[model samples]
Target: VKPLQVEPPEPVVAVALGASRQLTCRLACADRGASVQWRGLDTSLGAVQSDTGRSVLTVRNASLSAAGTRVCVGSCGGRTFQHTVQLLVYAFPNQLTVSPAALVPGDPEVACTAHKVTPVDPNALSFSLLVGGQELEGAQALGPEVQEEEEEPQGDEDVLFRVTERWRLPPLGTPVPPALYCQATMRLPGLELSHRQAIPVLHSPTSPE
Candidate 1:
């Protein structure tokens, strides 16, 4: 007989970090009696089993580490039929922050960050800077920034992203600089997320009191 055809078959098994999923390995009638095994899942991940004669791999509280290539194999007629499955774990940001924590001028410029977002996609991400409610002419793109968020006792750590934009405000010759805010937008295939931060205009030192 011929080897059974097997594949992930589904476009995505979109699960959030610290969630669960059941992956089933399918077999053709001719290969139903074949040996079955799930590669890439370890004993730490738990064991695989036969459910109604089909191999089912259950992932308990999946983590970011679970997002990788998984393989299913079946052996029949002294041959093996193998297939690959891909997993994608995604999460929206929990918080947005602008540093200095307070707005400061040119010295540190201005930095906007999105925290606790997962499955960061450069292509699906965008950033913008605005002052006085108007978007900046040229703003920097959002990219991965080195940030370590303390993991929750619940498990899974949130990732971080930085939006780069040089904030240079034209002199209004006034004590109070207008409001400046930065925005970050990111997405997965079905989910779109955004974060916006407002900077408090500080009094200029050289201004007349």
Candidate 2:
């Protein structure tokens, strides 16, 4: 009678953007001879066998689209073994920028602009404003539904107005210290701040135009 032997397991592996990942599977058997097979959950993934017992996968500039799980099977002496691994791909967060980094008294109304980008869901977006590193707690902010008209021939008809909530400055004599700052942030579904901006406040002499 022969004693049964155990096989060594596969190791966890991670790959960076625009890099290659290699996963090696080693087998321990009475004969020390084994063959390794690699399978990917998503068949579209480019997975290749580097050698008799090694599997290698490469991703070009890995992105959100390249995340998933993988499994490897090992066969030795008419016996079978398996292992699973998870793959994660990371990307830099989309950023938000505002015009007029500094707010002046004369410029009471400053436009909070979001640069147009591709592959972004505008409907799922929300916004907020911060002041001097602290989020403005009691400030009212508003945005109107964007509308477009086919009436005008020469000029476009897309016009935006203040929505239900209008952004209003702090009340008069509110002791808004000099060098105050304002910011706009995009909020997540639960009203959690996702993106934020900071703008310096400038004061000007009051005069009627």
Candidate 3:
């Protein structure tokens, strides 16, 4: 009689959207005559590959639709054991754009845009525009949602979201900060991610430095 164990003891697994991840299961106490299979809650993840006492389930090009409960079943010592893993998939870009590319002494309007971000739920994300660390209230809004066609759909198109905000620059003579910030946050029941980018000011009237 042997016991079955799975890699990544953590109940949750985090994988970047469009990336690949592998889940492994192994039998302890012996490596003979034991086998393992992989299964999913409602769909198939991938084919299972097995070795002496271990099995691997490879998930390729992971997508939002593939995020959910996955199961690893093992038959060892004439007994069946199963382990469940929750997939937390995310798509957050590392770059933000603030325009006009260069700020001038007389420029009055500025905009910040974050592109290609996917929050598991539409309501789980928020964006903020900050000047000198102070958040601009009511200035941030969600942009048009984008549909992605690279992944197989669960009866609908996968959507990526955008965040953008535009605000008039502070009146001239109000001390201009050297930089502004565009921040994005995704908050879910057990997952939270934050991204921020600093947009530098150019040709400031106060000081070019």
Q: Give the distance in Å from residue 8's predicted Cα in candidate 1 to where it truly belongs.
A: 5.4
Q: lDDT of each model, Cα atoms only?
A: 0.62, 0.45, 0.67
- Flag regions of model 1 displaced more than 4 Å: 1-8, 11-14, 41-47, 100-109, 119-121, 130-135, 140-144, 149-181, 189-191, 196-209
Clashes of 1: 0
Rank the candidate models, highest lDDT first: 3, 1, 2
RMSD of 2: 10.6
**What's the residue-level lDDT of 48 in candidate 1?**
71
Pick out the ten consecutive residues of candidate 3 with the lowest summed lDDT: 137-146
lDDT of 3 at 11: 88
In TM-score terms, candidate 1 sits at 0.62
Candidate 3, residues 1-209, lDDT tens digits: the string is 33667777778887778787777787663546677777775343445677844787777778777788888887766777888888777787556677776566565666766677766345666667676777844443535444444457475345675566566655533465576677777775567778777776654475455
lDDT comparing candidate 2 with the true structure: 0.45
TM-score of 2: 0.45
Clashing pairs in 1: none
Q: TM-score ranking from best to worst?
A: 3, 1, 2
lDDT of 1 by residue, 1-209 (tens): 33444433664556666677777786664545567778875532435778554787777776666677678887776767877766666555667777666654444456666666665556656666776666755444434445455667875544444334345434423344566677777666556667778877665455444
lDDT at residue 178 of model 3 (Cα atoms): 72
Cα deviation of 154, candidate 2, in Å? 34
Over 98-200, each residue of candidate 2 has an lDDT whose tens digit, in order, gives: 4455666443444454432211233434455555565466556665433223446885332222211235655422334354343333332233234454555
Model 2, residue pairs in steric clash: 128-185, 129-183
